[model samples]
Target: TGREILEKLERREFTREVLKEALSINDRGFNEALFKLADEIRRKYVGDEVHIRAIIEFSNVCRKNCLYCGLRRDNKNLKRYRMTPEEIVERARLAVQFGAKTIVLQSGEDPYXMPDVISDIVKEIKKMGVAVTLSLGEWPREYYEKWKEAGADRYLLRHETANPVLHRKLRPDTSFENRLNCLLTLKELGYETGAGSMVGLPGQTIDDLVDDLLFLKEHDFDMVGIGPFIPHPDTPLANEKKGDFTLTLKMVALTRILLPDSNIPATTAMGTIVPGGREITLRCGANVIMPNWTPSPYRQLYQLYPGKISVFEKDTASIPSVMKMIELLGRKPGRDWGGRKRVFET
Candidate 1:
């Protein structure tokens, strides 16, 4: 049975049953299946190159109030803050000087800040000879094009889920089509498009997860990020169940097999759930690791969910420690392959 499943994976012939079976195994068995699958997929396509990226959460202001987010518009308890364009550019430069290949600017959805302000920061980062990626929430096509024109090389907008009904329930005001449109707009603008979903959210099913995988395959995204859903204690869905780490690992491995050319990262949420989680992800077909570069005080303000991992703290400080962790996992940490400009295997 294992051999048959491996054969199907090798050929990229995954059916619904195969995916379900892969997700259903026990932890140890599941890991064994995935390790073999990931190694085969990596050797066949990606070789041995590892990519590392640096992330900066520039702002905490948001317009939309998602039920599971700590940065919801109505969350008066949160300490709201915004980073000036100068501060963003300075931190971005520091990240690059420290061996980061790509500087990812992530923020909650805040339209009050002018597009020109955001674009100026992108241009400034580009001036430093490092590629920039934007994770500002959903916006109009004109805004996306403006950022692209300003020298933004990539855009990351997680769809959260592909199932229309579930997406509607989770975000009543946001439609699946609208979110997808933003991703498509980025691709059309020649930016490397990144999209992903949250696993193990309340009411999620294997079918929904399958649909997400299929959606990514059909779109041929340049990057795919999948992370477990960690409930925010301050949100409406605070009581909802947390995601399982083992299943998340399996999904990462499957993503590597399906989209061998895409950049997959071990999210900090994974590291929060399990010690050395990023290393585990690297072993299972992930090539990118995003350590937070946001200032310590502002770091806790940008929580999409509670108990978020912030590397600026004592345990995860010093870029050398992060690189050493990667090295200990049998992977190399280098600046040459750090950004969105690096090519992925087809």
Candidate 2:
């Protein structure tokens, strides 16, 4: 029975079958039960501390033509923007002022901010005693090495979906093989590698979602970010139905059960889909939050998906709102770098 699978998970047997049954849960009682068990495992493994990192969408200029992305070059309605290197360093400085010990620099797959520029940004951010994570799109091995040399501590590359057929359709300009190669290269370089998936994409099936869980384990990731597929109005998926929000939570919970020590963030997309969404994720499996530290002017413009979370002037410096929420949710603020902890360390 499915209950036995979840009970096995409760007893610490988290495997492909447990993940499959957990994701297949249609009953609210059964779902909440597994989510609670996942929460307990999160507390046991990662403790009650929620890791918060500041994220800056440095540039909205993407070179690729990803059909699902609003920042794609074909989006004439979007105003392409780029923050100067100095401005980025300053942005990071202010984010650190907000108690951020980890900084995530992200942008579309644009080449304007070349490796040297990105490396310099990472180098400067590290001077403030914070860890650096890059979410810039795919890069060549040399670029990965250059950034590694420049003091980057982590890299987040979301594989979007594990189903090759569906993946090819969404990102016609890219391929899964290429993306997996880049992730493998990053891991080989000993940098903390992060690969993520989008739940409830158009054409996405239950088995495909299950395979996504298996892919995380197979890729041997250090971090995994799960967000519901919220369609972009300017993109090809604009008319598509919104992804199943509940299934997204199920995947997040299952990810925690499978990769208990992996760093999972309560993504802004989740909040966009449901109010107080991120705080709810903390109660399940998520233990990280990459708060918006990007400048206000550019913040509203970097919408890869509709209804992205925004940041304001007053809201920039005193970002303890996230920590406050964590405390209210019975969690503490994470003080360490918050890289994926070893399972043995638990």
Candidate 3:
């Protein structure tokens, strides 16, 4: 029955029941079968080029206090910093030199950094002929519109989990409705909008994970970044166990299968949980790698979770190794601004 179900999934037949069954499949052999299908879909839809996006964590001063974030306003143990607009642009320039076609300018929900300041940075980065993606958290609709006007090509605001109750519990500062409204606003502005979820969040269940995939399918997002939930010792959920690595991979595979053309990244949090985690994700379905380019000490201080990789190295040091990993997998590194090639385009 599972074999028949997977065949249906391959033929573009999917429903919540089918997806729930896919995620609930517990057999070890079933995992590989599912991964093989997802990898094939990735190849056919997105091809073999692994997109690289350089991430610059320009600011960590957040106003909202999400329970799981290390940079939450309540966490005084974390040293805060905000790179000047000029410094942010310089970091982006260095990333371009190192072969990043897309620059993801990420930060906490810091109000201190005004919309015009970020818009100026986006204009400067756009001058370099690279795509700019913003991950600044929930803000006014006017701010999103302003940034899009400034040449931002994409936006990433993860839903974190699909269960509204769990979402509210985790991010008490905002409601589930408001979070989703932002995604809709971004889409309305015609940005390549992204919405993501974390695997093994505290109190999450199998049904919640299924709803996550269904949510992605309903929205038809341009990008999805799935990662394991690593516990931050200083946060409210400090004693909670880390996310299940295998389940995280299954989510990535299932996402690839359902949204065949979406750009999915092998997240750095996956690498933090185990050795070769990112490689395993690439093999499964993910086709993008966002190597952190936040300059030195700030990188270390921006620790969302403990044991995050690449914090100790130079900002420019890891690109060669990142390329080597993709080469070893026989996948070419993407050369152009690696935007999603929609299924309709093909």
Candidate 4:
């Protein structure tokens, strides 16, 4: 009976009842079967090359006050810095030198960085023979169009939660409808779009997570990044419990089963909470590992949540270590741009 549920999911007939059935399975044997199915789907669809994106966090300043993030505007504890366009481009060049085929420029929503400056940085990085992905938080459609025209290949804007009430409560001064609209605009602009949610938020429910899965299924995102909610001591949720690792893995596995061809990443937040967490995720359905290429002093400064890894490690050592970890897991480090490949694209 459980096998039939999984088979229905595998066949892509995902009703809320069926998704709830899959997510609510608690027995170890069923979970292993679920993970195995997810892994099989991953192999047949995305292959074994683990894409390592070199992510540069160029700024620590954000205007919005999200209750969960350390980068919130009201947090006086964080020392903020915005990298110059030159420094950002230089770090991207180093990432390419380290054999990273994709350079991810990530920052909190810092308006000081300016629109044309980012467009120029994207243009410079594109000249260096690698792909660029922007993860700066929500911005206007005009800026999105400019960056896309400047050769930005992808954009990652996580919805963080699917519950409209919770989404507004958590991220103040923003609306759920506007967030979805931003994602839609990126899609219309031809950016390889990504959207994801956090697991184990204080008020999250199984039904909420099911809605997240259904949401991911509906949009057909080119990439999806889901991870546990590790609390920062500076944030309002400091005392709240972190997301369950098993539940996070289950979400990752289900996402793969639902969006078999999507570029699912084993997020660093997983590795922060548990040993071998990313490796465990890789076995389930994850195919991407984004190594932090954000240069130090500032790297340590860009603390979205506390206990982020590679805070002190030199980029020289950090980059190679990630590749070694991939190889040890019996997966090769990807050498291409690691763009999502759909069946219809061929």
Give lDDT for model 1: 0.80
Task: Report how far off residue 213 is in candidate 1 (Å).
Answer: 0.9
lDDT of 2 by residue, 1-346 (tens): 6678777976766576676777776888898887898788888888987889888898999879887788888889998889999999998998888789899999998898778999888999999998999999888899999999999999999999989988888888889998999999999998998888988788998889989988997776889999888889998889988877688988888888878888899888888899988888878898998788878788888888877765444547436778778778877898788877787734
Per-structure clash totals for the candidates: 0, 0, 0, 0
Total clashes, candidate 3? 0
lDDT (CA) for every model shown? 0.80, 0.85, 0.91, 0.91
RMSD of each: 2.2, 1.7, 1.3, 1.5
lDDT score for candidate 2 against the true structure:
0.85
1 or 3, greater by lDDT: 3
Regions of model 3 farther than 4 Å from truth: none
Which of the two, 1 or 4, has more TM-score?
4
TM-score of each: 0.94, 0.96, 0.98, 0.97
| Pairs of residues at least 3 apart in sequence or in different chains that clash in candidate 1 | none
lDDT over C-alpha atoms for residue 329 of model 1:
71
